[PDB]
Design an enzyme around this catalytic site. Structure first.
Site, short mmCIF file in Angstrom:
data_model
loop_
_atom_site.label_atom_id
_atom_site.label_comp_id
_atom_site.label_asym_id
_atom_site.label_seq_id
_atom_site.Cartn_x
_atom_site.Cartn_y
_atom_site.Cartn_z
N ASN A 96 0.73 -1.26 0.00
CA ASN A 96 0.00 0.00 0.00
C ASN A 96 0.77 1.33 0.00
OD1 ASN A 96 0.47 -0.88 2.79
ND2 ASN A 96 -0.81 0.89 3.35
N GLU B 116 5.70 -2.75 12.41
CA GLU B 116 4.53 -1.91 12.18
C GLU B 116 3.58 -2.92 11.56
OE1 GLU B 116 4.11 1.33 12.68
OE2 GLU B 116 6.13 2.07 13.15
N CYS C 119 -3.11 1.31 6.57
CA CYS C 119 -3.06 0.71 7.89
C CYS C 119 -3.72 1.62 8.92
CB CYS C 119 -1.62 0.47 8.30
SG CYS C 119 -0.63 1.98 8.38
#
Ligand SMILES: NC(=O)c1ccc[n+]([C@@H]2O[C@H](COP(=O)([O-])OP(=O)(O)OC[C@H]3O[C@@H](n4cnc5c(N)ncnc54)[C@H](OP(=O)(O)O)[C@@H]3O)[C@@H](O)[C@H]2O)c1
Ligand code: NA
Ligand code: NA
Ligand code: NA
Ligand code: NA
Lengths: 499, 499, 499, 499
Positions: free
Chosen positions: D166, D261, D295
């Site tokens: 992404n 992450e 996210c």
């Protein structure tokens, strides 16, 4: 008595407190009477040092003091301060009594100050949070390649701690603590009007092991102190007092590191969304606490149209339901002011406000040479700025109440006085709060509480006429300490390979 | 010319530089001649402002300046400084020429200063390393439970930057940079003897977009500046100069935030294990660089018995093999001193040293009203302390050489002068180095290099007579910024559950 | 006995220590024998928890523990730790006795560990130096204009503290202290070979007021602990042990915050300018201390040609003049190793070194199942790298001695082992020292001293196979705490005026 | 083309991008097709390295890379990054086009990512704010008297940067920047589904002077990367991805420094006093931005009874008035999802919510293999927790709307998902905000804005299943750097005199 056992001289009825001359308690200068604001009676006398003794004391602090303070490892300085805390704590009642008698402080207020002094001493460990230097690598500039830097702090040497009358115990303990914890010697100069607590504190410190040639307590009156501030052996001057004296201190001192806590009043702003019970309660307290003889006292209340009525009304109720008497009755809420002179000024200031359009909402009645009712004067926004209670700091239990249209008017009025110590703001909206925090020109803003420096858990200090620099746990290091930079050169020595 | 296109007025032969009055270049006060130390000729004139213009300039900086500087986000201030760096860089030769002509600075030394000024401007980004506040949780004390604190910095408002003659370009750019990067307005007051570079720098800054009402350049002579320092709208004073003027500045200014870089010389210590080639080379340079007209110049050399001979001999060779002439010949090593007065003093000081037992090892010959040979005077330890070259700072290319028994004697001699700016130590042993670093009472110690503040990659400042506080990348923030504390009260509001 | 009054169960002769299940002492799992290395005798037994109890303990620590630890204000956590220090201190002798008996630690070494544990507890106040967040203003980027940021730390929740055998008391107290001071609950898992001190410490902590559901002590053997590490309620794992187990721990744990102190030996480098008395003395001690059963033990000595002879000779004298016996005689210098298995390995490793060209310079004689003479094996640089005593960590009182040509060879040899915990360097030259500090790939370098983590006044941890992250006063916060960022948006709300 | 001039191989119609092997672009492993989500067509191919090349690349990064990155002074690393920023900036359109084509990113969203990557590179200077060590004096403990400590950071060596799909450009530039600025070499492993931007970025970096043996780009698919993570030469692993892969990464990697992450969604809370226009606008955007493939996307909206109606209604209007098409029309608001598989899951999740009591308030219609309408599903508080859209992260433009009684219910629901990346809260009351900030278990809370990591001006990272540690300007230093402690011993050397 007790701590001051072999120190206090009982000369013809009144106890005589000598100055501490960096090694021995004594003094051969004029004797000065110390009176109580409770009854204007002479409760003791203090011996001031002679010019020769002042000079000799400085020579000692400078030549031996700096070294015995600096060469006592921190771990021992910490033990000294902790033991001093133990000593003051077991002598709590005696310390409190002197405060009540010598400063006219209400019993519970005096007990609070002793406890504050004890905590300050015990938390010296927290002052260590700002200990530690900076390592600066040199490969971030071509000129400094293969070079390196270390920055750390070093004690300045001898710090002069000059103190006010309204916190005769705490201010002395505070300045002594942060000055000493980093390795400095100290010359304490208390207000000549209530120097007894300082003498007791210094004795407790000396008993605790404080290097005997690294501390001094000189009972010098006003301008007699200039002699200390102007001396080259005094590397820093920690002064808490009035704007006017502070100014004179720097002009006499010249180049030197300074911390100037110069007070002035504090404005309080109430937003339409504030909890009025909390605000009324806290503002009332901020106005009358210790007869308004607090630098962080509330001197101006600004409330938005919609809550102004209730707020002012509630604060008025609270102020008038107060009991004014002798600080001893745990029933008395407000004791006397340090001098009849102080009350005269308060009266004059209230008349001035009234003449300029002000109306008294509570108090106003003088009850004796040193007694008055904490007063609340309402004033129209269009006339308050020319009132003495606004332009000046009337050290007394008196504040102005002003209705305002919105936050911006509250802010400009709050910033309109010449001071900028603290400011209180009661409200709930983060945006209005954030705006006020940015635009209030003060050293500290208290959100939903009255201004209260406490023992300096949070740092505080002034802006504008309220002074410069800060005192606080950890932060005061910047005033009694100097930086030392060590630059190492390894150019071409093969430590680095072009980097 | 060029930058100062429509600014410089060509009045009857000599270019006339006006003052910048926070909006427009001008001035209606007396005109003052600016001369070159190369030939005592008047190379230009500067227009000083009138009392009315000074007053009006302050009113502008205070009422509009603080806000246009503060309300210009940092990201734009950074762009302004970077663009100002670009402008000065492309005008490098012109900037250098003025330095050589106006300050008598050797061509390469003048080029170095311009490059230093350009880098300072470009590295403003590094000053951000000391940006950021402290969050103080309140559950570490019972009194502060359910309380919280935020501490951050805020620009003071208007900063007065007073500058010396020996770094007319860099000091002005430096003080302007750190004052402005944090949101302050600035009043620059250059030495009236060489104010041209400052004027050029300010023009480059204004061209770069520096808020026009947030900066000022006043060509005021000496005491005429007191007017600025004494004003309440000036919240901070950044002064780099002589001890004596600095003292007068504070006594005139009163309570205010200060940075006092007061120079004085610098001692250099050579240990028996030092690389004598490095030391000789660096000490020689530290002695003569820009005709010793550097605050961080070496004024005293202390070497241990075993290497003293070689060292002093080598430094003497180097100093005498120097070419003294007009700063223009890239062949000339040393140009003139700023005034014949300065040379007189150097001569007098050398005679004094000789009379008191000193012997000249190199130089000593005056070559003209403003020209002299960099001089190296040897002196016995038992007599050096009473010599003028020791007790005072003779701003000239002259240093004393003293043999010492060991490190302790080197240290006590090094600490014997009234100053404490920097100190250099050449050696290899970590223990002896660590001892010297602890006991040398100076703002900075340079290990195996000559003292060189550079652009302040490493912070520097004085101790003792050398002043107070520091300048440096990141560190200067402490002088043009004040703390603001925000204490939030959540007592009983249910944020915490007893914690 | 005493502390473990109603805790220890006297079952048929041997005292039985139960596990602490976050509320009650107990356990219904297998019982395990605990022996002394002094005589291989069973001195006690420990009750391990059942899978059901482990599960229930975790549920308690997670659901109630995190909240009772976090909701106990720091000021009280500090009081708990200080009171725990008082309790352990008055029980010093009992604590020491158990260490001597259970770990075979020499009397004075055991007394040192108890004192270290007491100090760690008392200095929890210093851990506060790394408490406080960062305020990040947003006007340094266009995208973040009128935005603001606050960064602070928050306890992770439940921390698993897994401990080694060589410091059964200190490691447990240490991990518990830094985990708890910030608001975390803790699951302690001691080495099943000497879990008695941990049990005593936990009891002292519980007696001191440590939230009863915020701590746990599980006597689980090796892989039985994986159950804890692999659980999602365990947010952090603080592990001090061997490289191999540490690796297994992470592979079982997965994503989680970790501190891995994995030891390995430590090399010591002696420069030609070193004080050989200091070095010989410190290296000898670093080799034999607690029978080399220290992660920061010296396992390799590298000395430059010119001092190699004296140095190795002096260290040999010292090692052989050592008294090996029962840890009780205050006359015995070295006690037994934790197991006969450990001695076997040491013997095998010495034979290996000898076979590969090594020569024994001191020691080498096994004196019993668990007793040996601290051994010093000399080895040629060209053969040492393939020796087991080099490639591996032989947890025993044994080190290699290698002559080297210069600093670079010393450094490459020192970096040649797979570990990188600490390194010691004895010398005087700042340049050679600076080079060694840059190129030694270890968590910490000790200049002119043997490696000694102490109570972590200075932070330590590994590089390469020695692990990741650090433990230390203040520094350990980074392992049991997580950051929390709060970004406030005031875009277009009028707080700022384009800035 | 352009940057990838002599790099891209035009093999039979489709451009073939090779891997960069730390010195030369190449690869002799399988070739893999890269498709566009816009039309499922193969727009290019990437050459993956062979096991032998992976091994050789690691050997290079480890043996030469660490040294060429570390031995390039910071000032040059900074220049490399700035020049790389210039290169990407002039190639903005090409970079954007590839993002739109390869990732299906809307034109303006793709342009934003390129600009973010350029800024990250240019602000590397700000990362320096967290550079600098700590000096720890030793006189605060008896054991450490006459001792001293220096703590600083050192690059770990080789950092593996594994990246998601992404933000194929920014994540790669980000990890490379913070890894390299401190002196590390880097192995970048992009998502095999859109590795083109990474290849372009690396080329721009190499062109800018990035040490050619200090960087690598390996087109390895999924588990093929484990080979890199499990290798001992890789000292740190910076992974941004799904919880499940992150877990596998650590279990494969073992002991090592990590930054994980792991995303998951983000809940948004609206208080009754929120500005509903701001909230509706920001929440709508946080839900659909880049087809929810963020996210930090909003996946749950919790609003208090009194504003729930308006809020949900307004957000619904906004979501349905969106244009779904080909990312090229600057008119299209939402492009396709990275794969038809992703859409299937979104559909299944919406059906699940509906079956469990949920009602669609906007969207719900699939428009093609990879196209869908951003959907808003309302769900009763008593049933939402069992819905897939709640328990899991459905990477798509879909969020749940839940009415809540008060702040506490909002908070418990917000904390009820297994993730804890960020959380948004819209409201005005400082008390309710402070409570929410304390109790929301997430790495970051966004007050009055949608969650947006941006370029990491403010640090971010997860809690719970969202991972561990943080990325941000300055903060990321903690993940690619290790501490190095230097303890100096001066005991009895006369530096200090008992202190
Ligand atoms: N510590 C450091 O970092 C540092 C750095 C560089 C130089 N220095 C020292 O500072 C001196 C610099 O050279 P300098 O000869 O130009 O010394 P200076 O005369 O002390 O420089 C004074 C600066 O203050 C102005 N000034 C003079 N009287 C003033 C007054 N009464 N009120 C306000 N401002 C006044 C001067 O203007 P006019 O030109 O009109 O008199 C000049 O701009 C040297 O002694 C050197 O050692 C120290
Ligand atoms: Na003075
Ligand atoms: Na003044
Ligand atoms: Na896991
Ligand atoms: Na591994």
């Amino acid at each position: 008595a007790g701590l001051l056992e072999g120190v206090i001289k009982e000369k013809g009825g009144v106890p005589v407190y000598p100055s501490y001359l960096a090694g021995e308690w004594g003094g051969s200068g004029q004797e000065i009477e110390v009176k109580s604001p409770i009854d204007l009676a002479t409760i003791a006398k203090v011996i001031s040092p002679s010019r020769e003794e002042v000079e000799r004391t400085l020579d000692v602090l400078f030549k031996r003091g700096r070294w015995s303070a600096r060469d006592m490892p921190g771990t021992e300085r910490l033990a000294v301060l902790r033991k001093a805390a133990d000593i003051i704590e077991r002598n709590l009642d005696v310390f409190a009594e002197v405060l009540v008698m010598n400063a006219g402080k209400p019993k519970s207020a005096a007990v609070g100050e002793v406890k504050a002094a004890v905590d300050r001493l015990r938390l010296a460990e927290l002052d260590l949070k700002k200990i530690g230097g900076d390592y600066i690598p040199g490969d971030w500039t071509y000129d400094t390649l293969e070079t390196e830097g270390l920055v750390r702090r070093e004690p300045l040497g001898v710090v002069a701690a000059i103190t006010p009358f309204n916190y005769p115990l705490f201010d002395a303990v505070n300045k002594i603590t942060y000055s000493f914890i980093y390795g400095n010697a100290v010359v304490v100069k208390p207000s000549i009007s209530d120097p007894l607590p300082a003498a007791m504190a210094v004795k407790a410190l000396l008993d605790a092991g404080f290097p005997p040639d690294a501390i001094a307590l000189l009972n010098l009156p006003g301008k007699e102190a200039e002699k200390i501030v102007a001396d080259d052996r005094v590397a820093a001057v920690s002064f808490t007092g009035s704007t006017e004296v502070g100014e004179r201190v720097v002009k006499v001192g010249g180049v030197k590191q300074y911390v100037m806590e110069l007070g002035g009043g504090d404005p309080a702003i109430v937003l339409e969304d504030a909890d009025l019970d909390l605000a009324a309660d806290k503002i009332a307290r901020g106005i009358y606490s210790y007869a308004g003889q607090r630098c962080d006292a509330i001197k101006l209340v600004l409330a938005e149209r919609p809550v102004y009525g209730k707020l002012v009304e509630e604060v008025a109720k609270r102020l008038s339901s107060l009991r004014v008497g002798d600080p001893r009755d745990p029933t008395v809420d407000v004791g006397p002011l340090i001098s009849p002179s102080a009350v005269d000024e308060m009266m004059a200031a209230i008349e001035d406000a009234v003449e300029k359009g002000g109306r008294v909402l509570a108090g106003g009645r003088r009850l004796g040479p040193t007694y008055v009712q904490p007063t609340f004067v309402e004033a129209p926004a269009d006339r308050v700025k020319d009132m003495v209670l606004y332009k000046r700091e009337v050290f007394a239990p008196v504040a102005l109440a002003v209705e305002v249209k919105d936050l911006d008017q509250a802010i400009e009025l709050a910033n309109g006085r010449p001071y900028g110590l603290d400011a209180a703001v009661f409200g709930r909206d983060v945006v209005k709060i954030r705006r006020a925090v940015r635009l209030l020109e003060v050293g500290a803003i208290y959100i939903n509480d009255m201004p209260r420096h406490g023992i300096g858990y949070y740092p505080f200090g002034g802006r504008k006429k309220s002074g410069v620099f800060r005192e606080g746990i950890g932060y005061a290091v910047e005033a009694v300490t100097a930086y030392k930079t060590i630059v190492f050169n390894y150019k071409g020595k093969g430590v680095w390979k072009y980097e």
